[PDB]
């Protein structure tokens, strides 16, 4: 009895950018298309009717059912651009809207700059349970890339989608079998472009750690030590250089471990020099 | 006679700590429930009233009291909001929020500091003779792995229901100066993994290598190397400052740098106390 409204969704992803490592957020620009069948109506000339922006509100006040679909993992209200409604005489309703939002997800940067990320979008009706509103299908359209060389992230594979049901324990006490919500999940897999960090961090640090062992070729103890402190100062100067560029994180990356290795190599070389003189 | 309001708070995210401002960002949902004046609803069934439609119900006489976040910094970013109106008078208000919240934050033990993230909710105009909070329930995020997180949540959320007596507006009316307040608290420990391996460990290896200057043969060698280590501690102090949060006091790391300056200044006084 009283079948839920099947809503068909299409999500267009124009851009994934502005990753904030410490906040575990990323910015997504795109379009959301949602379609369902309502009660048939009289439209001018029996052709579809286009209602956009502030006029949608006028139709809602007058009784038109436009459910609020929430981005579960959005961080603050998404910046909604233009929005329209295509009302068909046959009863169909199509809602299209441009959006820009900051989306959160679990982001592990421990393998940086060689880290892989899954950028997700989670959509769910704000007030209507799956006995009232259910998602029938999800279609994802992503950007057509010419050259990824100039891009920070490298998209790997097609967009992964899911349609699940979210059962809420705080709603069990409210009403029987009315505590489940329909949820669309969209996932974009990407690998970081490590070109800048390979040539500007790993390679020069390697040339320094390689040159750090060349102190053993100095004739006297006074020369070997004074040069080891100079290399120590260089590793600190390099650590200060990396810190000013590298993203803010509560853990250590591959680059951070290499700097600790650089400190270790010098401290080991210093212990070796002392184990020859006295 | 006072209206019993039942509140449920869902905490999705606690992030964006600003050490100098003593603020943090909270994303979540607020659920407020009370029994009001009975109504007629379409088909005599509960009625969902979303976003802009609510304003129409308020203008038409529906009582939706303003509940203020006491410790919010500026107006919170309210996302979707809705009412659920029952014919028996029951009202359920639910809304998504994101706000910057302030609280007393002591970072003197950084990076080993513990924080209490609080949320204080109180009616803006209605005293507890008109509106009182009957209960508070808090639901927090289910974490898979905290290794990848900056903060480590410790224990369940602590909740309180108190009455705030104001001495101003005591004269406005008698026994009308008390307000109902909900207090929710989230305890968290900082993840010190980055500061242990990248700050304490290398600084330790430097303070350890600073005493190796005494192994030198001549006075000319001992002194010139001590100034080099002095330059390194300044270099490390300017490395630290560039990463470390802005504070009006000194942290464990700041004290270790002063210890590094002290160790060199002590070693320098020791070398001078041998020559002349």
């Amino acid at each position, epitope marked *: 009895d009283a079948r839920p409204v099947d809503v068909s969704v299409s999500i267009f992803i124009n851009k994934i950018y502005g990753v904030n490592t410490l906040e575990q957020t990323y910015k997504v620009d795109g379009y959301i298309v949602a379609q369902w069948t309502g009660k048939p109506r009289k439209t001018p000339g029996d052709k579809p009717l286009i209602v956009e922006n502030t006029q949608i509100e006028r139709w809602i006040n007058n009784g038109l059912w436009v459910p609020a679909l929430e981005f579960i993992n959005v961080v603050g209200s998404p910046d909604t651009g233009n929005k329209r409604l295509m009302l068909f005489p046959d009863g169909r309703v199509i809602y299209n809207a441009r959006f820009l939002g900051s989306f959160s997800n679990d982001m592990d940067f421990r393998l940086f700059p060689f880290d892989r990320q*899954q950028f997700v979008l989670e959509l769910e009706p704000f007030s209507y349970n799956n006995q009232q509103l259910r998602f029938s299908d999800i279609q994802v359209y992503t950007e057509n890339i010419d050259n990824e060389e100039i891009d920070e992230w490298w998209i790997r594979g097609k967009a992964s989608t*899911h349609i699940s*049901d979210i059962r809420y*324990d705080h709603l069990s006490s409210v009403q029987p079998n009315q505590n489940e919500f329909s949820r669309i999940t969209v*996932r974009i897999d990407a690998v970081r472009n490590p070109s800048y960090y390979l040539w500007s961090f790993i390679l020069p640090l390697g040339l320094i750690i390689a040159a750090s062992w060349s102190v053993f070729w100095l004739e006297s103890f006074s020369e070997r030590l004074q040069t080891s402190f100079t290399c120590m100062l260089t590793v600190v100067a390099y650590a200060f250089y990396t810190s000013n560029i590298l993203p803010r994180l509560p853990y250590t990356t591959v680059i951070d471990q290499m700097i600790i290795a650089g400190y270790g190599s010098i401290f080991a070389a210093i212990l070796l020099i002392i184990f020859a003189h006295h | 006679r006072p209206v019993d309001v039942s509140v449920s708070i*869902f905490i999705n995210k606690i992030y964006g700590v600003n050490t100098l401002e003593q603020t943090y960002k909270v994303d979540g949902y607020i659920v407020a429930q009370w029994t009001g004046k009975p109504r007629k609803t379409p088909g005599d069934k509960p009625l969902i009233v979303e976003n802009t439609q609510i304003e129409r119900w308020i203008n038409n006489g529906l009582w939706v009291p303003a509940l203020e976040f006491i410790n919010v910094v500026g107006s919170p970013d309210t996302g979707n909001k809705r009412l659920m109106l029952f014919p028996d008078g029951r009202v359920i208000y639910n809304a998504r929020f994101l706000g910057s919240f302030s609280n007393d934050m002591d970072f003197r033990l950084f990076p080993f500091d513990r924080q209490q993230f609080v949320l204080e909710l109180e009616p803006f105009s209605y005293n507890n003779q008109q509106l009182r909070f009957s209960d508070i329930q808090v639901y927090t*995020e289910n974490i898979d*792995n905290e290794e990848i997180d900056e903060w480590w949540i410790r224990g369940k959320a602590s909740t309180h229901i108190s009455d705030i007596r104001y001495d101003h507006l005591s004269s406005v009316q008698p026994n009308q100066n008390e307000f109902s307040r909900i207090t929710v608290r989230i305890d968290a420990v900082r993840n010190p993994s980055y500061y242990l391996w990248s700050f304490i460990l290398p600084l330790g290896l430097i303070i350890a290598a600073s005493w190796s200057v005494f192994w030198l043969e001549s006075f000319s060698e001992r002194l010139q190397t001590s100034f080099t280590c002095m330059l390194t501690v300044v270099a490390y102090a300017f490395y630290t400052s560039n990463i470390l949060p802005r504070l009006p006091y000194t942290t464990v790391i700041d004290q270790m740098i002063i210890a590094g300056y002290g160790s060199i200044f002590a070693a320098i006084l020791l070398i001078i106390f041998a020559h002349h």
Partner: nanobody
Amino acid sequence: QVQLQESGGGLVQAGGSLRLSCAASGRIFSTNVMGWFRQAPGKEREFVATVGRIGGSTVYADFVKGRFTLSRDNAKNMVYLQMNSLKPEDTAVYYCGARIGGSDRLAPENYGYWGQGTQVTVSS
């Protein structure tokens, strides 16, 4: 690292019930990472149930339709799947996997340390 062990499966008539159990043993820090999956012969391994991100929420596959319930008992490190109103479509080997990482609770690839499985057979 950790080891997973399913139990509670078997032969049941249509409309019947079963209670699956999964035991975790190792460096597991929470019962939240655990998720139930199923695999019928000649079909892909599909998601059944796992915890939701926010407290009080549980993620269920679209076929569950209120019939199954995921439980936890955190202490003894175990999860449970109470299966009611079983249909012949539910016939499969039910697996218990621990989320290894990633950022998708529904994707079987972000999982690991999978158990041997527990066969559930729904008949006439």
